[PDB]
């Protein structure tokens, strides 16, 4: 989600950008501001919600021992999804 | 939780009024010379000070000394305390003489015109502690607050 400020500088995923009167942007003159274009916040928002048939579901992040510590997610509330605190994947109880 | 207010609306530079009538940043030397010039042209009742709620004692005495050196005595605070009788002559006239810890030794507490819950929350906690563990009797004159 790389947006650019009125002065032409790209805004990073952490929201950083030098303002108009900031001398520090001189460092980029003749060079470039390194910005990662793959915003993890926009990428996780694309994954679909996983429909499951239990009140409790577990997430290890995928890949077994290559993922994150295994956590159990309660799905009792029906006004929102259960989100993994480690990887951001979402879950919802069916019916 | 109010510490985060220390990161907003902060005064970081000396300011003076320009010709357009607006506050604008200046240096310490410029700002203090402006104030020092005015302080040297006034005396007595022409100079006064008001101390706000969060002022430390080192600044209170420094300001009192400076205004006294122009023979000013109008060193005021925002909070009022009646000056009738002894006024601030005797410390016992304006102190919590029992002390916070002394509340645990009292057997009757009379509250007059105070909501201690929101004025001195930890003092109110002490009162409830005695209420709970000492069967303290509490009476209140004022609005019937929780």
């Amino acid at each position: 989600g790389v947006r650019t400020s009125p002065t032409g500088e790209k805004v990073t995923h952490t929201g950083q950008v030098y303002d108009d009167g900031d001398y520090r942007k001189v460092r980029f003159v003749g060079r470039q501001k390194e910005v990662n274009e793959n915003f993890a916040i926009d990428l996780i928002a694309e994954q679909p919600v996983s429909q499951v048939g239990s009140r409790v579901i577990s997430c290890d992040g995928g890949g077994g021992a290559l993922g994150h510590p295994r956590v159990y997610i309660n799905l009792d509330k029906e006004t929102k999804t259960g989100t993994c605190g480690y990887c951001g994947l979402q879950f919802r109880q069916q019916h | 939780f109010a510490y985060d207010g220390l990161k907003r609306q902060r005064l970081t530079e000396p300011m003076v009024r320009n010709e357009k009538g607006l506050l604008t940043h200046t240096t310490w030397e410029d700002a203090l010379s402006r104030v020092a010039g005015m302080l040297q042209s006034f005396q007595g009742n022409d100079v006064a000070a008001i101390a706000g709620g969060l002022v430390d004692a080192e600044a209170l005495i420094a300001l009192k000394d400076l205004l006294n050196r122009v023979d000013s005595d109008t060193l005021c605070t925002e909070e009022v305390f009646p000056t009738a009788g002894a006024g601030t002559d005797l410390r016992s006239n304006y102190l919590l003489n029992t002390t916070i810890a002394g509340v645990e030794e009292a057997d009757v507490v009379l509250l007059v015109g105070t909501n201690p819950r929101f004025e001195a929350p930890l003092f109110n906690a002490r009162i409830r502690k005695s209420w709970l563990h000492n069967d303290l009797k509490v009476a209140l004159i004022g609005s019937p607050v929780d």
């Binding site: - | 209420w131 709970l132 563990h133």
Partner: protein, 125 residues
């Protein structure tokens, strides 16, 4: 063979400390307060000596926290306040001593939770 020296022990001139970091510093001698987040008391046993905090500013390049205070991280440990004070005095540091805070003994009774006629009766467990 021994000699008599009746002078106050002062070693400021043989420690190599710059003068500014002797005369202008204020040592604080104290027992650290228990971290309220935890119940353990093992970090409240010894006396600590630390110095007054000084300016930290943002590094223009990275934003890191820069300092010019050489004693910004210096914390010393003592068995008693007397040892701490003795160390401070011979090194020329002006200091403040704060008396040790100890929790006062409490009177605990599980049975008071069920009082027949006192307010200590709990309404839930």
């Amino acid at each position: 063979q021994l000699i008599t020296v009746d002078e106050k022990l002062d070693i400021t001139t043989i420690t190599g400390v710059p003068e500014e970091h002797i005369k202008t510093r204020k040592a604080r001698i104290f027992v650290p307060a228990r971290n309220n987040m935890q119940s353990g008391v093992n970090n409240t046993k010894k006396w600590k000596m630390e110095f007054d905090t000084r300016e930290r500013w943002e590094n223009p390049l990275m934003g890191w926290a820069s300092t010019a205070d050489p004693l910004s991280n210096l914390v010393l440990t003592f068995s008693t306040k007397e040892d701490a004070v003795a160390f401070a005095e011979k090194n020329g540091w002006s200091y403040d001593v704060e008396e040790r805070k100890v929790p006062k003994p409490k009177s605990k009774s599980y049975g008071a939770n069920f009082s027949w006629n006192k307010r200590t009766r709990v309404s839930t467990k």
